[PDB]
Design a protein around this ligand. Structure first.
Ligand code: F43
Ligand code: F43
Ligand SMILES: C[C@@H](OP(=O)(O)O)[C@H](NC(=O)CCCCCCS)C(=O)O
Ligand SMILES: O=S(=O)(O)CCS
Ligand SMILES: O=S(=O)(O)CCS
Ligand code: NA
Lengths: 548, 263, 442, 549, 56
């Protein structure tokens, strides 16, 4: 059975999914939609607040809904929602996913501990780390620890702010307060735990999540600074230091520069942003943030969960607002995580790979890339050709090109274990798609796909880069929808096929293995669905400081 | 030859500042504190313990020739590699006998191998601990210190700008010292970061208000106003003006410009 | 010449090098040693072959704690360093007769690559050296071992890091003294980007050569920013000659006569010398007897003041053999000097202001760090136009081991890679030899 | 009273004599003396279940706050007395909405787009077509679709603060534009100011786009000119019935994103990287033009003080206190410049001294005049702290005192001379005189810019010289430290307020915020900040409509 | 005016911005000297030549 049929049958109730014809113009326009009706009603209720300024009006411009306006199944869920409920402005789960990433920074503790012992003659023990972690959980959300006559942040509005510690040293982990421990051996399957610890070694890290309200009022560049200020206050208080001496500057340099791990790197001037903003998150970094890898051993499922989160992050929020704005890019993104369509294509490719090569059963060669990418692209195209309702669902060429090529690229990575062979396969898929349907995506969709084969295995200046470390600022990729989310899946795919615990950074992977995050990173699909249903409670609202 | 001037001003406040800075002016001793009690209030070590190093003896760092380096005599704590430690004071704005920039300027004239930080609320010296202890003795025994208006404190320093308490002592949120009502003395019960002392340290009797007006280095309208020291103001204005002229450049560098223009 | 000033050039040992030299003979615009030094800083690239190899062997790619499991490439790069260097030479040079220089260091674990000036001449900025060197290193490695196409991009990533996803070579295994211009604080700041610990490592901890190299780079940067133009040029030249190059032995003699002294006694010595040399004169005597002075020659007064400043740093930090005191020394040297005389301090307040922030950001929670990590392109220590950072270079030479971010920690291979370059390691004697070469041409 | 701050001191210290040098301490019960601290502690305990064991706010950790009296603060020019915690930007929705209203605003010239339509596309532009275009963009800018079938849209109830308006220097055209979407210069500004604005603006037309508050909270300031431009393009396509993607459309884009756009703030260098429309990029004169006190008051001290209050929230509390640092932050470094009428007293003293001795705008800038005014106002300010112990216990940190004294000195110098750089030179004189009087100044690194200040105030070099109005948080000397930027914004405003100018640096910015439909009240940042401190301010961008009841 | 800065200045500078910076400094001083612009107006000449640098 094809995985998308269940959704088509519900989305096109009363109609044969294989029938080429239908009736239009018979739905009442916007009035067919619960959500459109709600929107129009709020627009009218807004008239008094706006004092005469015109507002949303369904009679301005395009009369939406001459065709049937679709509901969408969030893939891997049973949630069916109108597209508007998946717009990032309308979906608190998507916004909290981004805020939880922006507000996280990781700081090594071994250098600060060396400053204490070597420079300040102060001993560091499990008990003193535990006391420090208690102090920073008062200081990080805005509590005072040294000065008299301090004002403080209202704890009620920053209850999402906290700090935890993790270590590759099992002997130290057994001694740390479990209330503040991210326990690698408990969060990860045994083999993944062992892999993570071999790379992390006997090193200790704190994970600081600054308040959601702070990154909403300010930006991502605030996060490493806020973390570092309160790390400094917490060392001063917990270890009873002089509150302002030369050694303190060493904690600062360590926490803001020498021992810090941020989520995202800075942008060039044309698209200027500080750290911990979406354009700076490499694809492999995002795959490590998503936690599907540690709860599923289905490499297709793992890749698909990453693609869902990355579609929200890169296409809807980054490209659709930060870099553009407006109605934005909801359905460019939802095509990669709704109706189990991408699932059908990727499970086909994974099963083709399992049968012909074995998962991780081939070294990367052009023969293998060509074989797999071609076959999965043909299968994907044939699905749109056999199901008119499928093609009316993924109505925009860009959507189709991204989804077929995502299945082709991930499947190639499953066979070969090589992300750049994967992305080479993605570029083959795109030019084959174009030649089959005599179309591809929007006006500027294939800028990176026509340059892609040559730059996939390039070793030059701004061309060559291992795929896991490419991201939204890789030059070819810096402008266009329908690629970045899927590239995150391609970064995850060879590692999921191998059963790796992470793609690029074991510190990132452990730092999000934490039930106390607000967004559920083990399944971005399920969380986004909960947001679409208006059932997700975000952080950072201001109800406690504003009138009832 | 050259006779140092130290600071401008025609008032008693200015002369007090000059007295602090002049290394040949002998600071009057107002009290005595034992070596043990000073070490206890500092709070970095216990008396009798070996001084702790931060690096090996200095002569193991100097195998290659540096003629300029060897021009400078290291203080004894540097020779031995002793760790750097600190003392920090808050000085009440109600005529404490020493005041923050006054301290910085005094230390940089009188003492060797100084790292000193000035803030409104506290003033810190960080020095090789061996030599810090000799310097600290002078800073607590002499007229630079009044136990009511000069608080020893490494953290939570609030109080320089506050009203005095009902016994005439400066505020201290950690109450590292208390007024002994039986004797009238100020007694330290904690060390400078706020750990309890096993044995309290008597710092003696507060100076009276009139003595503070006489020896303090702060200007206050109800003692001697800054406004009355026309000489001091004239020199401050001259420094400001000269800095403005140098930054603007075109007048003070006019002959340099003329050579660059070939005129 | 343009200016009438002449000086005697004295070495770091306090002995006369060159007598009666026109000031312009040490101008960055004229001195051939300064020109070669700046050319070498721009064209030189450190290639870490051992780091490239180990990054590849572990797939430890693209920066701090990154690993890409399954993408490891195991190659004997260091064992074949000579062959690889010969290939780098062929790819980087523009002709067999040009000034391309390739030097293996540390048993082949590192290479110093000096890109030919012909390539710099047709490039817009100095990043070309790193870019061309990186391209040659990547191809040399791929060709040496016939690295297959699907592994080749890992070699690229091992050499140049996360570029172009990052704006710079984050996590790369090559480095340059100058970082890329996209990270400059101020326009024209390229030469100011060298941390004090690197300066100390390049001069092998020799106090006055470190402060000289810093002064040379800082003041040359002042020509690049347009600050040393027109009215201000003579101030910057005199600053270089006196504070950086021990003109007339003033710097050395101030330290020598105050070796058992304090910041205050250094001030007294400097003011007295300035009065003898008629650099300053009494403007007005006040009621108390206080004499308020004025400069007779503003650029020369600033140079005398800056020289006392470096001498006070050496005396006071040298007494502690602990560099943390450097910011405090720069601050209170200027503060005391102004209230001793009524004169404007070094750089008309900007050295003192720089020291205020430098003190704060080397003792507080908010940023900065220890003194060795600062430089003229740092937001904290950019403000003085060349007169402060030489003190930090001198101070870190005199630190006997009190820092966590020591020369060894931040700059551990910088000595082995760059300090064999004579003009870098020993700038005073070599700038004096350059001055002798042109003194009669001015 | 004899002094504008005495009323507040007497209320803040429970009737204690402001002149008495002694008091009692350690007798308040610590944190339990404060309603606000007790509330915070109780919420922290109630958070236990949500946090599942992770420790949290605990008043028994570290410093036992409240060994002295924990002060309430009067927001100056109001009767609101609030605890300091109510002025923390995290706790104060008015402060956050002030920043968001600034971040979410961009101005775009329309004359180039109109030239593309007529000159490249053969389409006529009339008042009627502009009015129809403004109706379309007020549907498109908040996320309503205008061209494509099967578009999803933003929930209008979440973005009711998003709108677009138009203004023009052409009175004849303004008479023909729809009043509902017009910012009317002749109605918003006193006659003389209106005439001045129109003389500089000329026959040009501009649209003011305010993108939704929720967008800048979810994203950043760099989003704003882009979001604006996307929906400007959609609205031209729709309102003028263009081909929905043809060559001329790229001209609208380049005009709206680059050639004809006015942003609030400029980009940062890499060390402090941020896109446009973030606080560090807002020049001091730009911020003084955003504040609207100039158009409702002709008291130059009042106008400057309202600017300083808004700028203290923006630059010290939000920019330096969070963007560049974070944590408990810098509330009271900032509140010293807008509470208890303390700065008011010093600045009203200085203005009256200037009125008597020089006249407002009565002198050309000279060093004699700067030295005279700055010295006198600094001495007066210092004497206030010496005369009133409760005043000095209020502004307990030196930095606070230095900033407030120098602000009065610098603004008063600008009042006499009409020259902002003479003002800031006076500010630097005030600082070093303050330091020599009390043998202290501010925090460890307070006076980096003040010791460099005299030389760079009138400098003409590279990164030194710059007319003061155009300096801002990225001016190198200013890039790091509290207790200066807010007051510099007042000094930027002061000579223009004394002259009765309608703006300081940009007339388009000034008109763009003369709009009752802003959420924060920019005619009095003091009043609005007070309303937030009282938890009476209703901000924009909350998510109640999309989250469970 | 077309100003071509000497190659000697480019040779001891790290990048090509030297030409704008030196030229700006020369223009500012040439104007201030030509007309003896007073100290309080001089920063406006600087701002006219080099714009909003260094706030931008
Ligand atoms: C005006 C443009 C030119 C432009 O620069 N962007 C437009 C419009 C822009 C608007 C449309 C909103 C509105 O209607 O008010 C937005 C939402 C961006 C914004 N400003 O918020 C958008 N497109 Ni477009 N745009 C899309 C797409 C597409 C597809 C639609 C093909 C079809 O057969 O319907 C075509 C490109 C193509 O042919 O491949 C397309 C073109 C176009 N796109 C044509 C309008 C075409 C028309 O007249 O109908 N978009 C898509 O292929 C799917 C996703 C969809 C985006 C909205 C979402 O992601 O939810 C929207 C993304
Ligand atoms: C640890 C430091 C060193 C440092 O880098 N920053 C500190 C602490 C830092 C913390 C204090 C928070 C806490 O108690 O947990 C915060 C709030 C920044 C943050 N991390 O959120 C801050 N200071 Ni501080 N800091 C301040 C100030 C000051 C004044 C306090 C003088 C006094 O007499 O009380 C002095 C500097 C000076 O002497 O001039 C000062 C120093 C210091 N400041 C000393 C601690 C002093 C002590 O041990 O009591 N601050 C002020 O002068 C007023 C504004 C106040 C800031 C909070 C606000 O703006 O509301 C706070 C701003
Ligand atoms: C110095 C610099 O810090 P770094 O040395 O780069 O870590 C800079 N911080 C600051 O300027 C902190 C300013 C706000 C806090 C102190 C206010 S007095 C910054 O984070 O970019
Ligand atoms: O029509 S375009 O391809 O220009 C943009 C599509 S969203
Ligand atoms: O104590 S410091 O002056 O370093 C910073 C005060 S907030
Ligand atoms: Na008097």
């Amino acid at each position: 059975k094809k995985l998308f049929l269940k959704a088509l049958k519900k989305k096109f109730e009363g109609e044969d999914p294989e029938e080429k014809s239908t009736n239009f113009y018979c739905f009442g326009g916007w009035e067919q939609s619960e959500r459109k009706r709600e929107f129009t009603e709020y627009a009218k209720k807004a008239a008094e607040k706006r004092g005469g300024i015109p507002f949303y009006n369904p009679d301005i411009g395009v009369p939406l809904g001459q065709r049937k306006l679709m509901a969408y199944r969030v893939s891997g869920t049973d949630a069916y929602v109108e597209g508007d409920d998946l717009h990032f402005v309308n979906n608190a789960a998507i916004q909290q996913m981004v805020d939880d990433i922006k507000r996280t920074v990781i700081v090594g503790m071994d250098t600060a501990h060396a400053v204490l012992e070597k420079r300040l003659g102060v001993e560091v023990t499990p008990e003193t780390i535990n006391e420090y972690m208690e102090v920073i959980n008062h200081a990080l959300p805005g509590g005072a620890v040294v000065q008299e006559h301090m004002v403080e942040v209202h704890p009620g509005i920053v209850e999402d702010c906290y700090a935890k510690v993790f270590t590759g040293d099992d002997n130290l982990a057994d001694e740390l307060d479990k209330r503040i421990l991210i326990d690698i051996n408990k969060e990860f399957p045994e083999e993944q735990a062992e892999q993570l610890k071999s790379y992390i070694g006997n090193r200790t890290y704190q994970v600081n999540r600054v308040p959601t309200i702070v990154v909403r009022a300010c930006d991502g560049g605030t996060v490493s600074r806020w973390s570092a200020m309160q790390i400094g206050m917490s060392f001063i208080s917990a270890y009873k230091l002089c509150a302002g001496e030369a050694a303190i500057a060493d904690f600062s340099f360590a926490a803001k520069h020498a021992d810090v791990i941020e989520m995202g790197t800075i942008m060039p001037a044309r698209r200027a942003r500080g750290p911990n903003e979406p354009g700076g998150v490499a694809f492999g970094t995002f795959a490590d943030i998503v936690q599907a890898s540690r709860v599923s051993d289905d490499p297709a499922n793992v890749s698909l969960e990453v693609i869902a989160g990355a579609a929200a992050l890169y296409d809807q929020v980054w490209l659709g607002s930060y870099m553009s704005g407006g109605v934005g890019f909801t359905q460019y993104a939802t095509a990669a995580y709704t109706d189990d369509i991408l699932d059908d294509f990727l499970y086909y490719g994974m099963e083709y790979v399992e049968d012909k090569f074995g998962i991780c059963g081939s070294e990367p060669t052009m023969d293998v890339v060509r074989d797999i990418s071609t076959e999965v692209t043909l299968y994907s195209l044939e699905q749109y050709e056999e199901y008119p309702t499928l093609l009316e669902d993924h109505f925009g060429g860009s959507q189709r090109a991204a989804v077929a090529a995502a299945a082709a690229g991930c499947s190639t990575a499953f066979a070969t274990g090589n992300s750049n062979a994967g992305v080479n396969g993605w570029y083959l898929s795109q030019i084959l798609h174009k030649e089959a349907h005599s179309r591809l995506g929007f006006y500027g969709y294939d800028l990176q796909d026509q340059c892609g084969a040559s730059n996939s295995l390039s070793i030059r200046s701004d061309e060559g880069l291992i795929h896991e470390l490419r991201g939204p600022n890789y030059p070819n990729y810096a402008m266009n929808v329908g690629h970045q989310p899927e590239y995150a899946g391609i970064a995850q795919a060879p590692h999921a096929a191998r059963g790796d615990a992470f793609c690029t950074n074991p510190l990132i992977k452990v730092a999000f293995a934490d039930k106390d995050l607000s967004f559920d990173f083990t399944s971005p699909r399920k969380s986004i669905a909960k947001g679409a249903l208006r059932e997700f409670i975000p952080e950072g609202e201001r109800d406690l400081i504003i009138p009832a | 030859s050259y006779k140092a001037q130290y600071t401008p001003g025609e008032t008693r406040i200015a002369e007090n500042r000059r007295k602090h800075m002049n290394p040949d002016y002998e600071l009057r001793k107002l009290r005595e504190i034992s070596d043990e009690d000073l070490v206890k209030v500092l709070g970095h070590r216990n008396p009798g313990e070996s001084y702790k190093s931060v690096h090996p003896p200095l002569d193991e760092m100097d195998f290659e020739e540096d003629i300029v380096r060897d021009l400078v005599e290291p203080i004894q704590g540097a020779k031995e590699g002793v760790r750097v430690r600190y003392i920090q004071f808050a000085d009440s704005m109600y005529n404490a006998p020493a005041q923050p920039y006054d301290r910085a300027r005094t230390y940089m004239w009188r003492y060797r191998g100084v790292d000193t930080g000035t803030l409104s609320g506290r003033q810190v010296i960080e020095m090789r601990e061996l030599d810090l202890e000799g310097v600290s003795k002078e800073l607590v025994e002499t007229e630079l210190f009044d136990p009511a208006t000069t608080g020893i404190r490494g953290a939570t320093v609030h109080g320089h700008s506050l009203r005095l308490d009902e016994n005439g002592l400066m505020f201290d949120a950690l109450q590292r010292y208390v007024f002994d009502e039986e004797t009238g003395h100020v007694v330290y019960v904690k060390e400078q970061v706020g750990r309890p002392l096993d044995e309290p340290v008597d710092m003696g009797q507060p100076l009276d208000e009139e003595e503070l007006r006489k020896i303090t280095t702060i200007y206050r309208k109800d003692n001697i106003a800054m406004r009355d020291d026309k000489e001091a103001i004239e020199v401050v204005e001259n420094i400001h003006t000269g800095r403005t002229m140098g930054g603007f450049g075109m007048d003070v560098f006019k002959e340099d410009l003329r050579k660059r223009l070939g005129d | 010449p343009m200016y009438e000033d002449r000086v005697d050039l004295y070495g770091a040992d306090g002995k006369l090098l060159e007598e009666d030299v026109p000031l312009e003979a040490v101008s960055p615009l004229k001195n051939p040693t300064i020109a070669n030094l700046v050319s070498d800083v721009k064209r030189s690239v450190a290639v870490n072959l051992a780091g490239i190899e180990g990054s590849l062997r572990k797939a430890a790619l693209g920066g701090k704690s990154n690993f890409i499991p399954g993408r490891e490439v195991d190659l004997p790069i260091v064992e074949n360093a000579e062959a690889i260097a010969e290939k780098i030479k062929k790819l980087v040079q523009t002709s067999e007769d040009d000034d391309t220089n390739i030097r293996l260091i540390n048993n082949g674990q590192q290479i110093l690559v000096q890109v030919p000036t012909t390539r710099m001449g047709v490039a817009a900025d100095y990043t070309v050296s790193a870019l061309v060197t990186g391209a040659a290193v990547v191809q040399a490695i791929i060709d040496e071992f016939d690295v297959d196409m699907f592994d080749a991009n890992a070699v690229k990533t091992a050499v140049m890091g996360r570029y172009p996803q990052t704006v710079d070579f984050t996590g790369a295994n090559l480095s340059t003294l100058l970082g890329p211009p996209v990270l400059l604080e101020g326009l024209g700041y390229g030469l100011r980007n060298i941390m004090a610990n690197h300066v100390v490592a390049i001069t092998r901890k020799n106090t006055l050569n470190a402060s000289a190299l810093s002064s040379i780079l800082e003041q040359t940067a002042m020509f690049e920013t347009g600050d040393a133009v027109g009215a201000f040029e003579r101030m910057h030249l005199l600053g270089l000659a006196y504070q950086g190059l021990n003109a007339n032995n003033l710097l050395f003699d101030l330290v020598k006569e105050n070796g058992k002294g304090t910041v205050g006694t250094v001030i007294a010595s400097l003011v007295e010398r300035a009065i003898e040399d008629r650099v300053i004169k009494v403007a007005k005597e006040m009621t108390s007897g206080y004499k308020m002075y004025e400069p007779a020659d503003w650029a020369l007064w600033n140079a005398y003041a800056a020289t006392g400043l470096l001498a006070a740093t050496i005396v006071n930090v040298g007494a502690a053999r602990a560099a943390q005191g450097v910011a405090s020394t720069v601050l209170y040297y200027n503060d005391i000097l102004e209230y001793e005389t009524g004169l404007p301090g070094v750089d008309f307040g900007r050295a003192m202001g720089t020291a205020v922030g430098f003190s704060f950001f080397s003792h507080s929670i908010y940023g900065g760090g220890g003194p060795g990590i600062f430089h003229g392109n740092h937001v904290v220590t950019r403000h003085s136009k060349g007169f402060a950072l030489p003190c930090v270079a001198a101070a870190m030479c005199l630190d006997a081991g009190t820092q966590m971010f020591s020369v060894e920690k931040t700059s551990g291979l910088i000595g082995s890679v760059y300090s064999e370059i004579d003009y870098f390691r020993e700038p005073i004697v070599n700038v004096a030899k350059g001055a002798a070469e042109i003194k009669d041409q001015l």
